[PDB]
Amino acid sequence: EIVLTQSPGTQSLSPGERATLSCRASQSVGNNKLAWYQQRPGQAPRLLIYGASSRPSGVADRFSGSGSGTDFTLTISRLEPEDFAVYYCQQYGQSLSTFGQGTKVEVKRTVAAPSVFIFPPSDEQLKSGTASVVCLLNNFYPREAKVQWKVDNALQSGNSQESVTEQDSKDSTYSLSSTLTLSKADYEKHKVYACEVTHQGLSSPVTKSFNRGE
């Protein structure tokens, strides 16, 4: 099996900048058959480059593939707001075909501190048997933000799941949502519910909190 390794993982470039994406092969891709695909969120991938360098009709001429053997490179001479999505490389010169793991090209902005909010569980949810505290991180850059759940000043772990929105098409900021899930009995045994947020834009960690029922 030929294993393709793309580099780098994530890409932080500005609108108008030159994007150079690398694809490294496990072994010499026979007959120079490497293909570059673009995939936006929600839609099926679109062929950008085939035969390592050849470009299909209808594709903007700002994309161009180069390299051979084991080293391949996709080049966007000028990044424009549209092309910020995920890029995959796929070898098809063998019987078995394999893709890469993708390379996310994001918009780079001037780092934004997150707008932190916290929501106690609903009265209806408590009367259903389960409790869920929601910590919201609104509009921030970069993605790297850590949320720690503190109940009665104790780092809770195991529960709580988190989700990050795709990069916004207007301000290019991510938004995180963490949801601490407990049962009602376990929820009522305590008073201080707090969420601690660490991020680049925050000099010191911001801890937003409430007390159960006040």
Partner 1 sequence: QVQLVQSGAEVKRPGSSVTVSCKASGGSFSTYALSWVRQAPGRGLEWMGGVIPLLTITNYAPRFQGRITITADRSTSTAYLELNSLRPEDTAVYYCAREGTTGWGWLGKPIGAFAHWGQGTLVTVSSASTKGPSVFPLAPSSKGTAALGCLVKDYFPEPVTVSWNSGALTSGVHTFPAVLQSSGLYSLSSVVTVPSSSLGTQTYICNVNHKPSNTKVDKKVEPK
Q: Counting contacts by CB under 8 A, is residue 201 touching partner 1?
A: no
CA distances from 155 to 14, 113, 167, 214 (A): 38, 23, 29, 22
By C-beta, is 14 or 209 nearer to partner 1? 209
157 counts as binding partner 1 under rule CB under 8 A: no
Q: How far is the CB of 210 from partner 1 (least distance, A)?
A: 8
Binding mask 165-184 for partner 1 (x = CB under 8 A): x---------x-x-x-x---
Backbone angles phi, psi at 20, to 5 degrees: -120, 105
CA–CA gap between residue 85 and residue 104 (Å, rounded)? 6
CB of 204 to partner 1, least distance (A): 21
**Cα Rg, the chain, nearest whole Å:** 23
> Which residues between 96 and 115 bind partner 1 (CB under 8 A)?
96-102, 115
Query: Tokens at residue 103, please?
Result: 């390379």
Residue 136 touching partner 1 (CB under 8 A): yes
Task: State in angstroms the smallest separation of the CB of 58 from partner 1.
Answer: 10
Q: Which residues pair with 46 in a beta bridge?
A: 38
165 contacts: CB under 8 Å, gap ≥ 6:
174, 175, 176
Q: Which is nearer to partner 1, 84 or 103 (CB)?
A: 103
